[PDB]
Swiss-Prot record:
Protein name according to UniProt: Probable G-protein coupled receptor 34
Keyword Lipoprotein attributed: no
Record: glycosylation sites: 141, 218
Full-sequence range covered: 51 to 343 of 381
Keywords assigned by UniProt, alphabetized: Cell membrane, Disulfide bond, G-protein coupled receptor, Glycoprotein, Membrane, Receptor, Transducer, Transmembrane, Transmembrane helix
Organism domain of life: Eukaryota
Tissue expression per record: Broadly expressed. Highly expressed on mast cells.
Spans within the Extracellular topological domain: 60-78, 134-157, 214-233
Transmembrane segments: 12-32, 39-59, 79-99, 113-133, 158-178, 193-213, 234-254
Main subcellular localisation: membrane
Function: G-protein-coupled receptor of lysophosphatidylserine (LysoPS) that plays different roles in immune response. Acts a damage-sensing receptor that triggers tissue repair upon recognition of dying neutrophils. Mechanistically, apoptotic neutrophils release lysophosphatydilserine that are recognized by type 3 innate lymphoid cells (ILC3s) via GPR34, which activates downstream PI3K-AKT and RAS-ERK signaling pathways leading to STAT3 activation and IL-22 production. Plays an important role in microglial function, controlling morphology and phagocytosis.
Name of the gene encoding the protein in the UniProt record: GPR34
GO biological process, one term: G protein-coupled receptor signaling pathway
Cytoplasmic-facing ranges: 33-38
The organism of origin for this protein: Homo sapiens (Human)
Length: 266
């Protein structure tokens, strides 16, 4: 109903804007650059991950068009879920490294390539392990995805959520202390953009997860879980907003983005 239609509109607009921005940014990064120290590599991989999320969005949009009905199987459903989170976590780790990298400057290249390549292999490995468990179980083909599921007998799965939510806080914690130390004019202003994106899109999402996981391992009334279900779907949209806050971040990290954007606007 109302929740479905607001999600449809928000997802449509976010997909369009993110697609345009990521396409332009990826074109500029791929077709102009010859020598890259570390920032170009980091921003290129961030652009690729954003492109992945943008290409994943239309399936969820179509799902919300059809009044919450799924008719394409289970494998596609789990592929969509896996890709969405996967991009969420890649974006949190590679945005961490840009700050850590952009602090030694104020206070070479082969090391940044090593870290950059490791992240993609572990994300790819985690993609495969979700497919294998889907085929093995091979359960009845239910028509209900993107919906609340209970984990009363699946406490191990709650541990997957439990590890991530706490681990995100250390990454958020270290970024704060890094800024405090730092807290040259251009460098200081730019690094403040990293904190803006990190605090708006991602910080709210993990905070409410404590209540969400708490209701999972507990008995809940009819009123309670409906409100929790209402909150999470809206709460995910805020996390998916990083696809459009990243393009403005490209603008302040390099002049090539600035020059092409200036050419297009002028
Ligand atoms: O960026 C990543 C990969 C990563 C790689 C290395 C890391 O440190 C090593 C390292 C760090 C810095 C430098 C050098 C080395 C840390 C993370 N992120 C993942 C993770 O390891 O934290 C998490 C998402 N991920 C899934 O496979 C995945 C999970 C959960 C779901 C899911 C959850 C709920 C519902 C549903 Cl349906 C699905 C889906 C997929 C990839 C690995």
């Amino acid at each position: 109903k109302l929740l479905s239609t607001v999600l449809t509109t928000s997802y449509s607009v976010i997909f369009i804007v993110g697609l345009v921005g990521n396409i332009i940014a990826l074109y500029v990064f791929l077709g102009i650059h010859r020598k890259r120290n570390s920032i170009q590599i980091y921003l290129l991989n961030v652009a690729i991950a954003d492109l992945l999320l943008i290409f994943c969005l239309p399936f969820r949009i179509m799902y919300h068009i059809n009044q919450n009905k799924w008719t394409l199987g289970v494998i596609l459903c789990k592929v969509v879920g896996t890709l969405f989170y996967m991009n969420m976590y890649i974006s949190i780790i590679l945005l961490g490294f840009i700050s850590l990298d952009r602090y030694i400057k104020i206070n070479t290249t082969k090391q940044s390539i090593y870290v950059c390549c490791i992240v993609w292999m572990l994300a790819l490995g985690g993609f495969l392990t979700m497919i294998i468990l889907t085929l093995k179980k091979g359960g009845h083909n239910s028509t209900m995805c993107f919906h609340y599921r209970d984990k009363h007998n699946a406490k191990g799965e709650a541990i997957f959520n439990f590890i991530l939510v706490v681990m995100f806080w250390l990454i958020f914690l270290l970024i704060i202390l890094s800024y405090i130390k730092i807290g040259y004019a251009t460098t200081a202003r730019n690094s403040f953009i990293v904190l803006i994106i990190f605090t708006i899109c991602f910080v709210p999402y993990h905070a409410f997860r404590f209540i969400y996981i708490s209701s999972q391992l507990n008995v809940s009334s009819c009123y309670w879980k409906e409100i929790v279900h209402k909150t999470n779907e809206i709460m995910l949209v805020l996390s998916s907003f990083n696809s459009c806050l990243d393009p403005v971040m490209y603008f302040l990290m390099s002049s090539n983005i600035r020059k092409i954007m200036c050419q297009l606007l002028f």
